[model samples]
Target: KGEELFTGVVPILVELDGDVNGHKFSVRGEGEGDATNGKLTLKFICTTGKLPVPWPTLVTTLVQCFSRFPDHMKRHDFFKSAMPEGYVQERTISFKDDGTYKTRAEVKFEGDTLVNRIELKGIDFKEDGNILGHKLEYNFNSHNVYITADKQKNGIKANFKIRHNVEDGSVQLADHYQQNTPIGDGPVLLPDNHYLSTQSVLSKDPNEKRDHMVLLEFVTAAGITHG
Candidate 1:
């Protein structure tokens, strides 16, 4: 008798210039899985905002991004400070007792001056078997406030393939940026541990001037769908 857990890390990078009130701010953070016995965190950087963040210090642990003031930052580093305020959203997806998968989300803030939104909207996936190694593909794409593929303007898409190699024992990576830009609206975040390297830079400079990128890594702590 055992329970199943999905483990992963969520790395987010976003510039909330027009999204927030009038100030241009950005957020950077990394979140680990519940099964990984790690923590989740975000760093709000104020490019142009009120209540100057005295810069933080350097060298800290989980939940801390920067830990020093700009003046104290390394010579190689440039100007940047904590946001006057920003938002952090956390979401989890798993099976409820014994049924289909589910999602749960929460929002918190260091300060709510910006009153912005960082949502995990929705996540959906489809099983793939057309190919020998094809397994599953997940869609977490979001269009403004919606994450439904039917309404995707720009969102995230990921695939899982359990491949075997004739020359090297096992390997694979596919899909193109066409799935995100021009054709779509956002850049896809590739999981660190899922595939080798089928994705690239997060910026779709041609369509989206603002930058947005995410890093996700997940593992099946145990076979959750079946015993």
Candidate 2:
């Protein structure tokens, strides 16, 4: 007979670094799952200008939404149903050098609660032009979520800060943000906890102050009911 050494899914942690729209960034986090509970943390950073204001808030919203579902429901399926209304379209572009590229675009509503329209696009690499990579773009019709939430006095704030080390000629910016809604002290509604934290600094050419090293962190934990 086969042995069952573990009864629960092991926590997973991943770290990644890359560039998007000429900006450098990194992501790192961990998550775990079980028949009863689910938890995750993910972080993102852009070591360039002030971290975009919407990032933390967006991350928080996504995680909280995911935590509302059961583990047995595949994430993709859950997202399809739970995600804010949206439209997705795709197209392929063929080049003269016998190379083809695929692109996909999506527009969605994170409004009422946030932006009315958020646009995202992805483009594949092209060997014909000697371009060997992919690209992603994000566009929001509304102001940054962090700003919008505050404008309406919703009490939502994505912590943002900047620091400089004159002696080392280094400057760093960080954002530590969280979203929490207390549901129960073991008494009532489900508890929700989510976080997105990040730090960014100059990785090269401290004097130039453009190229950067961005680090991101994200997390979510929700309470479950048992009877």
Candidate 3:
């Protein structure tokens, strides 16, 4: 029975953008393991940026525009599509007209099953409503429950991080959660689960730490028991 589940395992992917050569670019994601308790979890990862030795004029201007139009440039396309999934039909999202398109969208899961192939899309525009470039697209594969052979009796924990750059760097963004436990199954099943919050963390050694860290935490409800 479990074997068949593994065969059709699909992991939903979430994509986010990062600065590359002072310009915006995207990353892709998908499931990394097997399904547990009818739940699947995945970590979204993006490709490394191709730094332009000499930043182009267009790139520099775009990056500066992005900084000025933060609201227009920032969007949570993932949440928009996640809510429409069959399992999240009755969900509600809140929107505001505060000039800035900042809002919280949410959906409640009805059961302990892994969600697959969820989509995230967003568009950033200028005050004049002109497109200012935004997150591209994300197509996630089947969901899978990841398990370590050494451990079988207990569910495992998965730690995912979104680094500022692929270079030797500290975790710029991260979401850590345990799956298949009495508490929560894993990443793919978490509701309203999206981009880790971008809150700035105070640095102990400001001079040494050039970048800031953003911490995100989440808990999932349980169903099946798996190693």
Q: What TM-scores do the predictions have?
A: 0.19, 0.24, 0.23
TM-score of decoy 1: 0.19
Off by over 4 Å in 3: 1-8, 18-23, 32-35, 38-44, 48-219, 222-227
Cα lDDT of model 1 by residue, 32-127, tens digit: 323233232333333344311111100010011111212222221110111222112222322112111111112122231112233221122222
Stretches of candidate 2 off by over 4 Å are 1-9, 16-20, 41-54, 57-227
Give the lowest summed-lDDT range of ten residues in model 3: 57-66
What digit string (tens of lDDT, one per residue) describes model 3 on residues 101-158?
1111112222323333222222232322211221111111111222221134222232
- In lDDT terms, which candidate is top? 2
TM-score order, best first, reads: 2, 3, 1
TM-score winner: 2
Off by over 4 Å in 1: 1-10, 19-40, 51-227
Q: After superposition, how far is residue 44 of candidate 2 from its true place, in Å?
A: 5.7
Q: Cα miss at 113, model 1 (Å)?
A: 27
lDDT of 2 by residue, 1-227 (tens): 00011124434333333332333434333343221233333333334444322232223221223232334432222112323442232223332232332333332323322111112221332432222221111211111112112223222233323221222343222222322211112211211222222222212224544422222222222222321
Worst-scoring 10-residue span by lDDT in model 1? 53-62
